[PDB]
Amino acid sequence: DRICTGITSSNSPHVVKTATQGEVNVTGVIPLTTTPTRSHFANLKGTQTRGKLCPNCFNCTDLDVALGRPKCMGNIPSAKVSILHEVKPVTSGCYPIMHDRTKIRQLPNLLRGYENIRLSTSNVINTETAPGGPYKVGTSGSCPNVTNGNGFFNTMAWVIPKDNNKIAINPVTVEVPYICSEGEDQITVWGFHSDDKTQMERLYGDSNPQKFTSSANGVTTHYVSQIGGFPNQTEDEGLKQSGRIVVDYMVQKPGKTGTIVYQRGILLPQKVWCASGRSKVIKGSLPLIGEADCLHEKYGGLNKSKPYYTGEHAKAIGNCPIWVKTPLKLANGTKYRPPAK
Amino acid sequence: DRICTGITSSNSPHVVKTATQGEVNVTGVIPLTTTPTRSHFANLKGTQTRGKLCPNCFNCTDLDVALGRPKCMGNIPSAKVSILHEVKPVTSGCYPIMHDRTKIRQLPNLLRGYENIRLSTSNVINTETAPGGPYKVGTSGSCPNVTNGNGFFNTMAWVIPKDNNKIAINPVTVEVPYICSEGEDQITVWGFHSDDKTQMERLYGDSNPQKFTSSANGVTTHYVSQIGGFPNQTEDEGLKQSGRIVVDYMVQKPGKTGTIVYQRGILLPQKVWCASGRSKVIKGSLPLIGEADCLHEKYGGLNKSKPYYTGEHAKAIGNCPIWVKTPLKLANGTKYRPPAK
Amino acid sequence: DRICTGITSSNSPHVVKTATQGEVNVTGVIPLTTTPTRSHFANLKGTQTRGKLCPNCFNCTDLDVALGRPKCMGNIPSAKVSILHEVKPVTSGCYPIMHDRTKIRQLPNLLRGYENIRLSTSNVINTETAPGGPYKVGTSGSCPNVTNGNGFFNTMAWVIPKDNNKIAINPVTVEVPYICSEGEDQITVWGFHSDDKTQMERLYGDSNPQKFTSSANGVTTHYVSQIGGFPNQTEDEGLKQSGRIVVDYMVQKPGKTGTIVYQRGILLPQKVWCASGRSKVIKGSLPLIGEADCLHEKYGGLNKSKPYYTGEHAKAIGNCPIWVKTPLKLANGTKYRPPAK
Amino acid sequence: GFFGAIAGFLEGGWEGMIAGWHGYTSHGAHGVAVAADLKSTQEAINKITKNLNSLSELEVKNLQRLSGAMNELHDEILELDEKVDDLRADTISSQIELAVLLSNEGIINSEDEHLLALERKLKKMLGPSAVEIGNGCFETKHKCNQTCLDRIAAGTFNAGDFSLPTFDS
Amino acid sequence: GFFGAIAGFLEGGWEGMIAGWHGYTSHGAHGVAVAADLKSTQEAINKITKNLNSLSELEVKNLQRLSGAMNELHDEILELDEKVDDLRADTISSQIELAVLLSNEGIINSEDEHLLALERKLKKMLGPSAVEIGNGCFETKHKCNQTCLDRIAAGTFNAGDFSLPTFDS
Amino acid sequence: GFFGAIAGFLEGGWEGMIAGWHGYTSHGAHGVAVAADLKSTQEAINKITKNLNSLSELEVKNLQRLSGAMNELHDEILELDEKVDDLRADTISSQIELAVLLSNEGIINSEDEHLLALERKLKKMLGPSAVEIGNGCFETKHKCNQTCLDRIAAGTFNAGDFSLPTFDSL
Ligand SMILES: CC(=O)N[C@H]1[C@H](O[C@H]2[C@@H](O)[C@@H](CO)O[C@@H](O[C@H]3[C@H](O)[C@@H](O)[C@H](O)O[C@@H]3CO)[C@@H]2O)O[C@H](CO)[C@@H](O)[C@@H]1O[C@@H]1O[C@H](CO)[C@H](O)[C@H](O[C@]2(C(=O)O)C[C@H](O)[C@@H](NC(C)=O)[C@H]([C@H](O)[C@H](O)CO)O2)[C@H]1O
Ligand SMILES: CC(=O)N[C@H]1[C@H](O[C@H]2[C@@H](O)[C@@H](CO)O[C@@H](O[C@H]3[C@H](O)[C@@H](O)[C@H](O)O[C@@H]3CO)[C@@H]2O)O[C@H](CO)[C@@H](O)[C@@H]1O[C@@H]1O[C@H](CO)[C@H](O)[C@H](O[C@]2(C(=O)O)C[C@H](O)[C@@H](NC(C)=O)[C@H]([C@H](O)[C@H](O)CO)O2)[C@H]1O
Ligand SMILES: CC(=O)N[C@H]1[C@H](O[C@H]2[C@@H](O)[C@@H](CO)O[C@@H](O[C@H]3[C@H](O)[C@@H](O)[C@H](O)O[C@@H]3CO)[C@@H]2O)O[C@H](CO)[C@@H](O)[C@@H]1O[C@@H]1O[C@H](CO)[C@H](O)[C@H](O[C@]2(C(=O)O)C[C@H](O)[C@@H](NC(C)=O)[C@H]([C@H](O)[C@H](O)CO)O2)[C@H]1O
Ligand SMILES: *[C@@H]1O[C@H](CO)[C@@H](O[C@@H]2O[C@H](CO)[C@@H](O[C@@H]3O[C@H](CO)[C@@H](O)[C@H](O)[C@@H]3O)[C@H](O)[C@H]2NC(C)=O)[C@H](O)[C@H]1NC(C)=O
Ligand SMILES: *[C@@H]1O[C@H](CO)[C@@H](O[C@@H]2O[C@H](CO)[C@@H](O)[C@H](O)[C@H]2NC(C)=O)[C@H](O)[C@H]1NC(C)=O
Ligand SMILES: *[C@@H]1O[C@H](CO)[C@@H](O[C@@H]2O[C@H](CO)[C@@H](O)[C@H](O)[C@H]2NC(C)=O)[C@H](O)[C@H]1NC(C)=O
Ligand SMILES: *[C@@H]1O[C@H](CO)[C@@H](O[C@@H]2O[C@H](CO)[C@@H](O)[C@H](O)[C@H]2NC(C)=O)[C@H](O)[C@H]1NC(C)=O
Ligand SMILES: *[C@@H]1O[C@H](CO)[C@@H](O[C@@H]2O[C@H](CO)[C@@H](O)[C@H](O)[C@H]2NC(C)=O)[C@H](O)[C@H]1NC(C)=O
Ligand SMILES: *[C@@H]1O[C@H](CO)[C@@H](O[C@@H]2O[C@H](CO)[C@@H](O)[C@H](O)[C@H]2NC(C)=O)[C@H](O)[C@H]1NC(C)=O
Ligand SMILES: *[C@@H]1O[C@H](CO)[C@@H](O[C@@H]2O[C@H](CO)[C@@H](O)[C@H](O)[C@H]2NC(C)=O)[C@H](O)[C@H]1NC(C)=O
């Protein structure tokens, strides 16, 4: 008798590419990829995930908190991972801002990039010694405080010239000191109020357009105020007002000072943000539902099964599958053979 | 007799590297690379390729078209691929511009980065309601229109105070509205005219330097005009002029307004660019001659043969060979053996 | 007798990963990595390495040299490799600068990025024809020159109105011409002096805040001076002064002019930096001690042994080992086998 | 493969071979018997399982957003960041594609190597009286029907079961 | 290679072997006859051809300009973009170099495997009367000149043509 | 490896084999003699040495600082630059890991291939009178002790030294 070595013959619907034999059918494959399905976003497994900056500040938007809107102060937990759920953050209270005239909207998205975020407990500028004659600090019914008295943004001081100071001024300069702790970035919020011709003189003793200039880390920004004829109040407390404020922020790196050159209507910086560390940030939506191995900008929360995945590549953090162009398969069988006669 | 298995012996001038035997001579190789030669640029096969912005705008530079120079209006076809043929684009007519005082030169290079480009069909600002007293619209012999009448850049309005209004103004603010369609970026062109002391007083009733400030997407830019003593006319119509204009552009993202704060001599935006999509852009030269699989910044148009290439790596679009450090060879033969003794 | 083929058996403490057998013990390995130890920085073998900009300028900081402080002029040798030893460069003499109000500190770090650095030999602006009435050039005891006479930064001219010219001016414009050779970048240094109300009137005939605006390659910067109440003198000659200067720099690409719009107190640019080529730059410290194959931001100078290394990855230049996640080993022996039964 | 093609190994296959990928056939008076070798099959499966673990061990850095770059303000920077992400995805994908290609190349190629090793298992069992043909076949003095073949696949076959000489281990 | 060096394979080669890369030689009274094996040559060429197709299948993303970053205004961004291109080119180049190195590794290594497979073709044709030496050579009882060798390469060699026994095919 | 496991090669190893990684054993009345084959060991070492040189030939672009981006002023760009460096380091690292993995895969796998080649050296020397078992062993008509085994390793062994027939060489 003749005994030989032989190889099986079976149904071979699966195909893999080889270096030296091209594509070949095989009896079995191990799929190395899946195409994920879109899901709700979630908490990243093994890491506290930040959504709203201040989760317990109810009826407060992230921008509200960043500006220091009254009633919107609260615990802001540190986080190594943060969700960007507002590409263009909006306010929901206080005095009417003309947001789009500065970069101010992105301020809370800037903050969330840090692991640790706290508001300073002392003021960065003393309103009782600030250049431009003597001041009193102004408030508004648009910004009701913790005891529901008329207040203002805790990051700023709406300074008003005293009755012996209702006069136009040349641009005066205040130096903004660095008051944060070791390693922290300081994010200084400031701006200027403007109104119609009549209110300008009542408030400031000048109805000409005012000019403002900030300078920090080589960056100068210049603004000129507008007198009356404003766009409509939006994203505010809803109480009608004839004036508008312009708000801006100024980033001060460790040990770096900034300057603000201002005239009438200045919103002097008071409380400032002190931030450190880095939070890993991706686009997502709220609320966060449950846990996941991986947060993916396109698929939301997803758990890891196969080592790779096919579909829409995008930013993703956590224990994630690696994106590939094609659904790769590892051969688990033999190259096809016709049945032997 | 002795029958053996043997391997041939031939001239083996070619060399390849191996993991476990180092470099070895072989009887034959398949070259995997070529060094391309510089050729004229061309149309990308299977993709309409943009050169000039407006092909039907004869005697018009791209910058001419972007500024809305009279006689230089026309269809600007969409393109998924664009050649950047001017690293520092120039004008070739109309009123004398002081180009280097702003970023204006790059405006058409910015436009070509988009797939779709159209000029707005309505004006973005009505000059008869624009801040700064009543205006009449000015023209020049430097800018002859299609009937050779005095005209101006169609993107701007050279607004002039009327005879009962020749007086200086404080900086006034105009909001530039977003007037483009769904998804489109708006590119707003604007500027200011200046002259010697005499013409300044005649035209505007003020011979002091005028100040202009724009603001959009967090970007502020500030300009101060110059009174007489100008640099000499260049890249213009060739008609002697005592005044100069400064032109700038302002990018407004979807649904975003911008502001311009101006005094006398302001060139208010009229027609604005509406752009969307992305065009793939590389450096090249004109004219485009024929077709090619691949456009290469250094070698121009070339067709794909070998899978890889050697030489000068640079940006390239289309069906291209992949750059490699060395002329790789695929072994197609046997390792050299001496003739058998 | 029976003769067989066999493989040795020895102590096999070393482990390697395989594709088809997982981790396996082996009798011998060739280590492919090391963890380097932190060392002093050094000269890069086969390449002159720049530390201080001007080595022969003793008791001069790089910023001193970049500003053209008197006594701090000298040869600045070319170098294809440069060490960044000051993340925020300081001055050590001359007239008191308020550094943080501009980007000026980074100027010598900007320069060292070029292979070649030279100071222009002629002035870029003739102060005797510069706009803003007739001038005399001012000096200070804070800036003693090589014969200890009163001087000033060689990059600038402290222009002062003549006794018959103590009068305020509107913002005037000067064009800064490009005076460098083919391919060179021009770095224009300029600024403005300011003082208390009394000295301002003495020096300039105006005690109002002055305004300054520069423009080059699309970049505009705006400054407003401060009148008295300055922060304390620092990093200067130590000689008490009532005034402060603000210094900035302006990058002009080949053939590009820039403009400066200024009033009183202007420090007009004189000598300008002409730079070309690129220097490879990494963070490090001085002095450079000896030679090394590789300069590594974290380990300093290190010589190359193994092809790879493990530890802290960072920027590194020269003949360097390649970073890897894990200590890789090449097998130099046989997979472990138990002793024969 | 290419070895078996040149060596004149049988290029076809046996549908009767179900319990495994590799094995033996017996041609005689009984017709044609077929048996799978579990040892050779298990080894092939283990190599692949190890190869799967190796491919699954790869880690690459997450791509997330820049902490400093703000929408609208830094859109130019953000475009470059998008490009950085896109090229990372592209490069690593092709690297994995390469790694997997080489894995399958090894797996498919190893088929003839298994056969060559099965020759050595068969040869020793058949004893010195058997004749090695060279094409992966041996000629025996004895009959070997399905019962006999099963003993070979199981490694329990003795040549003394036909009073034929053996290589004694 | 390393196999042939240890196995005592002939390290030299035959200039007379022109029609192919691999084949047979016959040493006897006729002198030394030389013939190429077309089957073995074709297989080697097809493997390389497939290997060429595989290398040619790689696609990578185009590198173009940033649409948003403008000259002069954004030169810093553009420098980083230039760096991104440079590093992409460098990385993909080294990856392709690795792929080609392994490809050439396979092709050069497969030589001895081809020789080993030609042994199995030669052996079966020569029949049971020939003696396998182990060094890739067989000693025959019969003479084999160039005409004989050509029949071997062509696969038509019969041992009964010398009244010698055959493995019955 | 997997070949030797299926082929029934000896899975254990010989501590007496010191001069090399690979070689021969002799089983008879004397017990068990052991000799290393230096040629087979040397070849394996040369392959590894070449493989070490190949891995060491890889060059990658230095990562340095951007010349234009200044601290403080251009921190956003610099963050991206840091990211570019990190991803380069990450990508090249995994690529090198693959290159080394495949290298070690080849080296460990080649073991049985060495054994298969040592069979051919042994077989030819033993002459036509010896009997090939298939598991890497040969049965000889003659006795073969440590002195005998050593001559085999050195390639000087003759079958005529036991009055046995030889393949007459070329
Ligand atoms: C100051 C005032 O009277 N405000 C009320 C306002 O009054 C009308 C009429 O006086 C009218 C008469 O001609 O003129 C209107 O203005 C004209 C103007 O004359 C023209 O020159 C111009 O071209 O057109 C304008 C519009 O036609 C003027 O607006 O409007 C109504 C009338 O009853 C009233 O709501 C205004 O009173 C304000 O109301 C809000 C709530 O809607 C608040 O209660 C304001 O109290 C506060 C506030 O909390 O916001 C009180 C604060 O103490 C004060 N803050 C500070 C720091 O001082 C603010 C502050 O004045 C505002 O921000 C000013 O804009 O006011 C209450 O003043
Ligand atoms: C305004 C005028 O008449 N300009 C013409 C020019 O005039 C000379 C003389 O007045 C001369 C004697 O005083 O002085 C020259 O300037 C003096 C000046 O006194 C000093 O301040 C200065 O420092 O020193 C100078 C002397 O050293 C002044 O320039 O004379 C030339 C010679 O023919 C003449 O071309 C000028 O007229 C203009 O010419 C151009 C063609 O070159 C056009 O036709 C101008 O028509 C336009 C235009 O089309 O551009 C007509 C337009 O309707 C008008 N546009 C608007 C919106 O008003 C423009 C506009 O006035 C100018 O562009 C403003 O600069 O002019 C034509 O006016
Ligand atoms: C400018 C001056 O004379 N400074 C001297 C200083 O003067 C003091 C007092 O006179 C006094 C006046 O009341 O108070 C100070 O000013 C007060 C005052 O109330 C008001 O004027 C003001 O509104 O409020 C201020 C509140 O503090 C006033 O500054 O007195 C000291 C001690 O006596 C004296 O040393 C000062 O003299 C200057 O000293 C420096 C070194 O300490 C140099 O020698 C100065 O010479 C130079 C210089 O080299 O820097 C000479 C240069 O030629 C000159 N350069 C030019 C272009 O003019 C500079 C230049 O004036 C200053 O540097 C610009 O600030 O001065 C020497 O003048
Ligand atoms: C919440 O807002 C209320 C009112 O908007 C704050 O209380 C008020 O504070 C102001 C100024 O401190 C008081 O006004 C007067 O100040 C002058 C200063 O000279 C003083 O002389 C007057 O006698 C008068 O006090 C005002 O009376 C006071 N209370 C009320 C009911 O208005 C309150 O401080 C805010 N809450 C927090 C936490 O800040
Ligand atoms: C080997 O290759 C492919 C496996 O995808 C087989 O071809 C496909 O088989 C399906 C199943 O009936 C049919 O739609 C077509 O015959 C093929 N479809 C496509 C999309 O290619 C092929 O038949 C396999 N051959 C063997 C012998 O197994
Ligand atoms: C690779 O395929 C083999 C079979 O081809 C899988 O092993 C068998 O799995 C089935 C059920 O899944 C069992 O009944 C058999 O006993 C297994 N062993 C055999 C047939 O020998 C194996 O699981 C696959 N590999 C992976 C990683 O999934
Ligand atoms: C192996 O290939 C190399 C490279 O072609 C050959 O060396 C070349 O020989 C030619 C002619 O003798 C010279 O012109 C070249 O300068 C040589 N190049 C180098 C790098 O040395 C070598 O002769 C070949 N060897 C064999 C045996 O064919
Ligand atoms: C080109 O030339 C002039 C602009 O200088 C325009 O002529 C005007 O046409 C309107 C038509 O309603 C008349 O009312 C004006 O009186 C004309 N002005 C002059 C100075 O002739 C002409 O329309 C322009 N054509 C364009 C812009 O297409
Ligand atoms: C690889 O090299 C071989 C040379 O051995 C080429 O084979 C020759 O090709 C020609 C033309 O196609 C034909 O006559 C034969 O196939 C071969 N000729 C001889 C004399 O052997 C083969 O074409 C090369 N492969 C590639 C892809 O270029
Ligand atoms: C294979 O290698 C591993 C790791 O080198 C050895 O395991 C170590 O053995 C030492 C004893 O000298 C212990 O001190 C370590 O704690 C062990 N570490 C681990 C991770 O196991 C193992 O003994 C080696 N096996 C053989 C057969 O040599």
Ligand SMILES: *[C@@H]1O[C@H](CO)[C@@H](O[C@@H]2O[C@H](CO)[C@@H](O)[C@H](O)[C@H]2NC(C)=O)[C@H](O)[C@H]1NC(C)=O
């Ligand atoms: C260094 O020292 C002094 C600076 O005061 C310079 O010498 C003076 O220059 C002025 C120019 O107006 C002339 O009055 C005299 O030449 C000197 N006057 C006094 C009072 O010293 C000298 O030129 C400076 N520069 C050098 C030496 O290169």
Ligand SMILES: *[C@@H]1O[C@H](CO)[C@@H](O[C@@H]2O[C@H](CO)[C@@H](O)[C@H](O)[C@H]2NC(C)=O)[C@H](O)[C@H]1NC(C)=O
């Ligand atoms: C890898 O091979 C051996 C590991 O056993 C290393 O040691 C050499 O081994 C040879 C045996 O053939 C002898 O020359 C010596 O025992 C050793 N030589 C030296 C100079 O040490 C050998 O060095 C290793 N090779 C490399 C490149 O690391």
Ligand SMILES: *[C@@H]1O[C@H](CO)[C@@H](O)[C@H](O)[C@H]1NC(C)=O
């Ligand atoms: C805002 O009010 C102005 C007039 O005050 C009007 O033109 C415009 O339509 C209003 N828009 C909105 C959104 O209220």
Ligand SMILES: *[C@@H]1O[C@H](CO)[C@@H](O)[C@H](O)[C@H]1NC(C)=O
């Ligand atoms: C084969 O083997 C034995 C005889 O040797 C006996 O079972 C019978 O004849 C045969 N059985 C089968 C299933 O072929």
Ligand SMILES: *[C@@H]1O[C@H](CO)[C@@H](O)[C@H](O)[C@H]1NC(C)=O
């Ligand atoms: C080879 O063998 C046969 C014998 O007839 C024939 O082809 C020829 O005569 C012989 N000699 C040569 C050189 O072919």
